[PDB]
Amino acid sequence: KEVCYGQLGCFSDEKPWAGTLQRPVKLLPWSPEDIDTRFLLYTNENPNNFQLITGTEPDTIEASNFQLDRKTRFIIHGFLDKAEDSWPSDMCKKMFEVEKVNCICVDWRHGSRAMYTQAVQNIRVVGAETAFLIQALSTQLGYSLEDVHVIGHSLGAHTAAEAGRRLGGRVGRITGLDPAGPCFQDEPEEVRLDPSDAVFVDVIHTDSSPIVPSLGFGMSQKVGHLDFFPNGGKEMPGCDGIWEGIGGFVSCNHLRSFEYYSSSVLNPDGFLGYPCASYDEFQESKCFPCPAEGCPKMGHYADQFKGKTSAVEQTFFLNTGESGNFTSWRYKVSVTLSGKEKVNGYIRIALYGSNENSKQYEIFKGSLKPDASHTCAIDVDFNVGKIQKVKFLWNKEPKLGASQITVQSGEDGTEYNFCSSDTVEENVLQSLYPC
């Protein structure tokens, strides 16, 4: 069984679209008119109020603020969402602050206000709608598919993917933001996002779990050239009995994926990803510092990563801030102690730079013997720059200090050594100096 929608072609319920374990019931997408896909174009010149453009009548494009000499990024929302006065339109607005771009929001809110397994079908029609438009740009205006960027969140990512497939993966870039897990994880490449969908496919995983048991809406499966798992991928900082998942698609963790990206538009290197097999390995500092070439910048500037498409499923782990701009930079801090007696307290250290200076961070807790070296990695929320000096602090009667403190910048690998012969009483900020 199949349905056809004029120029958008035919859609069948044959495997793997339906009638499979993950998609038991044989559904077919709604009509284009019932899904009501709308392309809302934002521009530097019209950042707040969209212009409505269609591929059916590409005189609408000419009339609009679309520019050929400019890059073009699509933003596709997911299940039970919209674009108007929401995060897609808010995201465009960020982009105008750093670049010149045709921002196109794909709004299919009516087709996304459906039972979920219906939305998973409707996306196909939305995906066609998009490609039909993307092809019109090439056909009517000679616009290159390399300049097209498609950013999709959740179902939006597989919608993105669908359009990418429809165009034989010629579209310049797809960015999948916590791509929807239910009805995609472990399924064939035809129906989900995968590296073949665009020249460059980069994915931010934030609410990831396997299908059994389900503990999130994201894919744990790696589906890009680059796959980022900030904070482990399962639970983001800031976010027995009957288990209710009746609103998972609006989980804080799940929505955090577009929050990071939006932030990365304005804070380019606030989210550096480190090459790593597991989050544990990263937590334990095996994936530090950045490779010589450099780290990929997770988010809007991922396209600058040297060798971004040399391999598929290149895993990256990083840590982010818990709130606000969400930015974070990684540091490995080594401190070796001095004193004349072993005290039972704990160590704090501060970073002092050219830009500003950090708060105090805990480094060790328990037995504090002299000569003892203690290493710890820390998450600083801002780029301190060149570390001019450091400060050591301890608290529980006698004197204690730090003789050497080593700080290694995750980003550029740079290693800073600091020294002092002093030892201090509890709570006194001893300051070390370059050596």
Ligand SMILES: *[C@@H]1O[C@H](CO)[C@@H](O[C@@H]2O[C@H](CO)[C@@H](O[C@H]3O[C@H](CO[C@H]4O[C@H](CO)[C@@H](O)[C@H](O)[C@@H]4O)[C@@H](O)[C@H](O[C@H]4O[C@H](CO)[C@@H](O)[C@H](O)[C@@H]4O)[C@@H]3O)[C@H](O)[C@H]2NC(C)=O)[C@H](O)[C@H]1NC(C)=O
């Ligand atoms: C997005 O994310 C973050 C928002 O949460 C931003 O990170 C913040 O950056 C600032 C520096 O730009 C950090 O530093 C400020 O605070 C430190 C230390 O504060 C500590 O001691 C205080 C005791 O009074 C307490 O109030 C604090 O809780 C904490 O324990 C201060 O030393 C600085 O203020 C003073 O010092 C410098 C001199 O170097 C002067 O410039 C100031 O005028 C002032 O005299 C800093 O203002 C801040 O801590 C940090 N926030 C967190 C939670 O980490 C981030 O910058 C932001 N934006 C961007 C662009 O990324």
Ligand SMILES: [Ca+2]
């Ligand atoms: Ca695909």
Ligand SMILES: [Cl-]
């Ligand atoms: Cl406007």
Ligand SMILES: [Cl-]
């Ligand atoms: Cl609203």
